[PDB]
Amino acid sequence: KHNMKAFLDELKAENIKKFLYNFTQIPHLAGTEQNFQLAKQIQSQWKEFGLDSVELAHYDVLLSYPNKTHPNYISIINEDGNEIFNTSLFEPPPPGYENVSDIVPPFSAFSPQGMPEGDLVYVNYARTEDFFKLERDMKINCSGKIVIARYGKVFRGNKVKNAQLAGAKGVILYSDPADYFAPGVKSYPDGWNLPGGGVQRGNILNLNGAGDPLTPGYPANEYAYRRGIAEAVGLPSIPVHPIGYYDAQKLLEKMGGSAPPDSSWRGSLKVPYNVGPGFTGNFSTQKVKMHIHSTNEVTRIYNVIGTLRGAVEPDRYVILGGHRDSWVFGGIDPQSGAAVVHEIVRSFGTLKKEGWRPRRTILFASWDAEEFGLLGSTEWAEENSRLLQERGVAYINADSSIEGNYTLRVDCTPLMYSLVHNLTKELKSPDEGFEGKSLYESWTKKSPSPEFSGMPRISKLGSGNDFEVFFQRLGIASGRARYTKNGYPLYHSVYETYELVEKFYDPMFKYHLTVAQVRGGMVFELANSIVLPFDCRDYAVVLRKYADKIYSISMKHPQEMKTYSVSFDSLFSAVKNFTEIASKFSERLQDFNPIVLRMMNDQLMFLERAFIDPLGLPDRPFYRHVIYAPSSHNKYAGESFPGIYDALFDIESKVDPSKAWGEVKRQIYVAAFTVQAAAETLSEVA
Amino acid sequence: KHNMKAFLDELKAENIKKFLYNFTQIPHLAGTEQNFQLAKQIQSQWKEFGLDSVELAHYDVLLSYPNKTHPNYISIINEDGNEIFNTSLFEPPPPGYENVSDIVPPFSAFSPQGMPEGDLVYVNYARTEDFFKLERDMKINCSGKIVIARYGKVFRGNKVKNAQLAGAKGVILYSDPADYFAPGVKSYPDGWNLPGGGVQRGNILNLNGAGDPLTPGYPANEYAYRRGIAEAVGLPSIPVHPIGYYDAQKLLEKMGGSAPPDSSWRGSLKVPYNVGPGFTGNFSTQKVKMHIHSTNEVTRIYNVIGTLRGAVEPDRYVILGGHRDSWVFGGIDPQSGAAVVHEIVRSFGTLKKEGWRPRRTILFASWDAEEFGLLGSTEWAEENSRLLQERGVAYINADSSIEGNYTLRVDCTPLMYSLVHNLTKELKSPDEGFEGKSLYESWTKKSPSPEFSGMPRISKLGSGNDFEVFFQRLGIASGRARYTKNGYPLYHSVYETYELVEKFYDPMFKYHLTVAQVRGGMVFELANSIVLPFDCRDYAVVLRKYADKIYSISMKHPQEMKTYSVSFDSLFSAVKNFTEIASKFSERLQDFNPIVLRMMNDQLMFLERAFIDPLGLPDRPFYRHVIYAPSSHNKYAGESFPGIYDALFDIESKVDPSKAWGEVKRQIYVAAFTVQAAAETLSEVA
Numbered sequence A, B: 001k002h003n004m005k006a007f008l009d010e011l012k013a014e015n016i017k018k019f020l021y022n023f024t025q026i027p028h029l030a031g032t033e034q035n036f037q038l039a040k041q042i043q044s045q046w047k048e049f050g051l052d053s054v055e056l057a058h059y060d061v062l063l064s065y066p067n068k069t070h071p072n073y074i075s076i077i078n079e080d081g082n083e084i085f086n087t088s089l090f091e092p093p094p095p096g097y098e099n100v101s102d103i104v105p106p107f108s109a110f111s112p113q114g115m116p117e118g119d120l121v122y123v124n125y126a127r128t129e130d131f132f133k134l135e136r137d138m139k140i141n142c143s144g145k146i147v148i149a150r151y152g153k154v155f156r157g158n159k160v161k162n163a164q165l166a167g168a169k170g171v172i173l174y175s176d177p178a179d180y181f182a183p184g185v186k187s188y189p190d191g192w193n194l195p196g197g198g199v200q201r202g203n204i205l206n207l208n209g210a211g212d213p214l215t216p217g218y219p220a221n222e223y224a225y226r227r228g229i230a231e232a233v234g235l236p237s238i239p240v241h242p243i244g245y246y247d248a249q250k251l252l253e254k255m256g257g258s259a260p261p262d263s264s265w266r267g268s269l270k271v272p273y274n275v276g277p278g279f280t281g282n283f284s285t286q287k288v289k290m291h292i293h294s295t296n297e298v299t300r301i302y303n304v305i306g307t308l309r310g311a312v313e314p315d316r317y318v319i320l321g322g323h324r325d326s327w328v329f330g331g332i333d334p335q336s337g338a339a340v341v342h343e344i345v346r347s348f349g350t351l352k353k354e355g356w357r358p359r360r361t362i363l364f365a366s367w368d369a370e371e372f373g374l375l376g377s378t379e380w381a382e383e384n385s386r387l388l389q390e391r392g393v394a395y396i397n398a399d400s401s402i403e404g405n406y407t408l409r410v411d412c413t414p415l416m417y418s419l420v421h422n423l424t425k426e427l428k429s430p431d432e433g434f435e436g437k438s439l440y441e442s443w444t445k446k447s448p449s450p451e452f453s454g455m456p457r458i459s460k461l462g463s464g465n466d467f468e469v470f471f472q473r474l475g476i477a478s479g480r481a482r483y484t485k486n487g488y489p490l491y492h493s494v495y496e497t498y499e500l501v502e503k504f505y506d507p508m509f510k511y512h513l514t515v516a517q518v519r520g521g522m523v524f525e526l527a528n529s530i531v532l533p534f535d536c537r538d539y540a541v542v543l544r545k546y547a548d549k550i551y552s553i554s555m556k557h558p559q560e561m562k563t564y565s566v567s568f569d570s571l572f573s574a575v576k577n578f579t580e581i582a583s584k585f586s587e588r589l590q591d592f593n594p595i596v597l598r599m600m601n602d603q604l605m606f607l608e609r610a611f612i613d614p615l616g617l618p619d620r621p622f623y624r625h626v627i628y629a630p631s632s633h634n635k636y637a638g639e640s641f642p643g644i645y646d647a648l649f650d651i652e653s654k655v656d657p658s659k660a661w662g663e664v665k666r667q668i669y670v671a672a673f674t675v676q677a678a679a680e681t682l683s684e685v686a
Ligand SMILES: *[C@@H]1O[C@H](CO)[C@@H](O[C@@H]2O[C@H](CO)[C@@H](O[C@@H]3O[C@H](CO)[C@@H](O)[C@H](O[C@H]4O[C@H](CO)[C@@H](O)[C@H](O)[C@@H]4O)[C@@H]3O)[C@H](O)[C@H]2NC(C)=O)[C@H](O)[C@H]1NC(C)=O
Pocket: A570, A571, A573, A574, A577, A672, A673, A676, B222, B223
């Protein structure tokens, strides 16, 4: 028999291990020779594995690299303009790789060049709320200052955006042991903690879903028009550089001015965590000086796209995708996901060589340039948008498979809640103490739902990974699953190696295997069920929760709601109608002829599509999903009813309340209309 | 047998006559009591005729009406501010209707209120080129002046837009006998010519496809947020009023200043056609004074939507629609079309009562508020956009069936060229001298193709009628067909009556019948063919013609093309690929299983959809079709490759040529990309 069990049993922990070792011996930075080589290898192997076609899709996009003969660094300078302390020019390489070439040193991709000098201000995590505190509570003025912020809590690009709007002239990012050093575990190479010389790389763009900064809306092909750098989308306007906590300690130890407003502002360094500005009396005349010399450069990137043509519905696509490019070795991010994808392609190809084909077409993708702003997935989706929006069933992401070894973590559209619950009930738990018990059982025990008894937590999708164009721009149902902790200390550091994984995370590759079963299990059911495995009633349940929540935010302002006649009645009405119509639809779907079948599967496929507004969100044309958008304060986090949420945010500070509440009302109308219109797609068609 | 012949033979000239008389006895102005009454009648009749459901879809939209106790008029005033001539307060009513109530007097819908006085300037048709002449050649300055323009050549809203940008403070529109009086025919009631007291009503909005000015993008439902009037879309900023040629003669006879630059600037009045500004010496101190008191008012409108559910593909919609609202009696516009729609519904209902159902769902629409900016069709399409873009096969418009009695006039997407050629070959010509010969034969003889021997002319779709949202915003294949002359003199006048039609246009209702056969014939084939009756190869042929044409425009500037490296190579490459892929697709479509069938019909249905750019055209978000857009200089006219055309227009006058030609290059990239992406939808799907 060729069924899901056949597929799942073919998957092997030992192959995932072999592929992970194979993908992590040399750096695979986007735009480099070694990453083009790996692309070609994967293309070759996927062909050998049995896919029908495997092609490279290339694009020429804006990337960013340090200057090899002109290193980035930070200084403390004295009053004679003398550099009395310099930050490190590279991370100490891990054992046995001290002779690897082409390790890119730590930098903030897309930083402009510059050498600003000034006085430091410590901004905690540089969240929206942290800047409100500095300015509004502590009356600290960040204008003309260099801010130093610890990584964590929110996407780094949002930190740099927040810093720019507070008027900073430079940002220094560092990893505080409070956030990146787990108590009682040893630093790398002797455990999984971040050593003091380790540094987190990462881009600091604010693209809001545009993809390549020079070609928003259109693929970066051979004949593309490009914007000039000055009109590019998302580029920061102040220099930015990341450092480790040994270097951070040196910069923070002399901080004067105000003390931290509270304990939530102090990390674990032997330092006062004084907010500044400037150093204490003795050192009052010393300044901080940045030296940033990185360059932005149009560079070719390569996605690998494999097709396994469907037997019955070849014009319906289920996509499994994840990126291949890494900052250095990528032992977790992304190769722990790419190895799982490789083993899934291998299994499917094994069923294929024995004569099986899935019902629908499965597309497999190895995306490039994820680390530089989701560039590879975005440009491909821009090129193929018409095919995807009329044919795309679902997108399953496959970045890092593990970020911990405690339990499963799933983030997906409500349409796939039932699918995941059912699949995880048929999978074995890899967990200690749950031998013989289902993955569903261990997961719900270790990660219980905040809302329901006997159910696991499933989170929203935001952004910050390759599903974002498919879900947030195009409205294709999307999901992701990984193993997680109770992100991880070595994130985007040179220490993210094969050895980290094999020694400290998953020696038996059993958690990798579990993730391959969940991702592959999902793809199989999406590509093979006769009725698509979506449950519209689950969307109805969450829409009421999100309506309750946004109403509760507005109701912090009862006087204004009275004055400006702010009613949520339309939105609750729409949610009620959606609930009724989806109940009826689900009755027909079980009570219901292939055209009825094909017509009906289309209602299911286009339901996520119906939450798309073609006009996008305000000033963010590429975020079009009215229910979910990446948080405007944290790209990684999903926000519900984002348009109304952003209209309400800090509304009490707006100068013209009538206009502000008018906009809240406008956003309620758009949300209610969109929920009703989505509901109406599930009505009888004629 | 229930086949097309059965359908076509059921259609009767005598019923079309009975319905036309029934729909034209009283005025049906949008938003009035009488037009709600007619809506309810049609709803009732369509139910009786046999449709499955017939519902009223209502919306509350911005409309415009004169003040009943404060009439609009124009004066000549002397130096004491004395009004020595006044224009008429109403058109003399036709015989037997001098006692009809609620005839709205001539006005320009959406004119602001005001009483500007100043000196007249005569601007010919107020085209873009006419204003270039005044300013650039004749050095005439329109700023602070009242312009007087003759109707014709272009949409009136574009005249008022052109006038505003030239700095005019008022516009007077009038009908010149050169354009509205055919030599040797008698004025109404004794023939079909415009009498000197007749006046053409019409709105002067510049909505660029937005629909209701207060709710662009979203339906004007009960809970809608509305823009304030000051932020409304499309409203003119200067008073505007139309007059007949008796009143025009009085205003033009005293015109001084410069003479007409040439004979193309003189109409048929016994007047110099002097451009001005101001009157000749003797009358130099007299001025023109407008008195405009109309008000804009949110008002309820009602569309009638009838459904005949498809037997096999109920989730595929073929739409026949046309408007019901008229300026006065609507004897041609629109009731000559609504009567044909009514008889088509009657025939289909006759097949239905005998047990037949079409393969796909047919939706029939009686739109409201067409005369006020396509409001009814637009708000309905905004409300149902998700259903229409995933389910809409085709839209056939049905405004006025006759505007002449000489020959057929068809304007449609290239996808329906073959369908119309084939259908018209099976229909009988109603023409004198072509008895026993096909409609195809008379039409190609009287209206030969400019390009091909033995073929008829088929024009492009632009805007100015209810197909515009479906075609230009949503990308649903659309068509229209009518009888035309070798528009018509009584257009939008009180003289457009049943008697006009029955006496002077179509006494036997044979031309109406021919149009009912062509519109109904098209709907039948779209709703009933097993393979949709579209030919992609016809699009390939026109794309090359339009690429040749836009290249030829650019090549008026060879030096700039050299300097700025302006290449059309990408666009011709895309057109070549489209031609090859469409050739291959058409081989498969004839060589090819219902899923193959359903999958294949989807490639055909979504081909028009693929020419949609979700980002729209520059500053015109609701015009999204990259091949066709309404001309920026004439809403009624279709423009090909509008984005590149507008980038090139008057480019030699642009101050920064580098930026200007950069934009031409950008538009070429967008067009080439869109043509390739459309081509790729016809490739094999996997
Ligand atoms: C959820 O689904 C329900 C249908 O199951 C849907 O109900 C609709 O609600 C609207 C109100 O938003 C109703 O609109 C009314 O329609 C009648 C004609 O049928 C009009 O006469 C009404 O207008 C009068 O009353 C208004 C209110 O005071 C006045 O403002 C106005 O001036 C008029 O005097 C009004 O337009 C509609 O009939 C129902 N449809 C039904 C019950 O079938 C509801 O809207 C859905 N929710 C959402 C968010 O879409």
